Ligand binder design. Structure first.
Ligand SMILES: Nc1ncnc2c1ncn2[C@@H]1O[C@H](CO)[C@@H](O)[C@H]1O[C@H]1O[C@H](CO)[C@@H](O)[C@H]1O
Ligand SMILES: [Zn+2]
Length: 55
């Protein structure tokens, strides 16, 4: 089962990044391989402020 074919330029549902909410690194091609919170294709939703923001 060979793999290794994930490349999204700017028109596909990119995979959320390992730390999209805090992705400290930033490259010109990394944004195409991983999506991030704040973009139209983000899709990670890993418990980011469930319901504790009432202050
Ligand atoms: N908040 C945050 N954003 C991105 N990457 C992050 C992170 N918190 C931790 N990491 C990565 O996980 C390990 C800790 O187990 C760190 O060393 C980070 O690894 C990064 O290092 C690579 C480049 O040196 C990156 O590709 C990423 O894996
Ligand atoms: Zn990232």
């Amino acid at each position: 089962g060979p793999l290794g074919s994930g490349s999204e330029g700017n028109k596909v549902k990119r995979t959320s990044c390992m730390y999209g909410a805090n992705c400290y690194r930033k490259n010109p091609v990394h944004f195409q391989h991983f999506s991030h919170p704040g973009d139209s294709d983000y899709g990670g939703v890993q418990i980011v402020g469930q319901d504790e923001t009432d202050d």
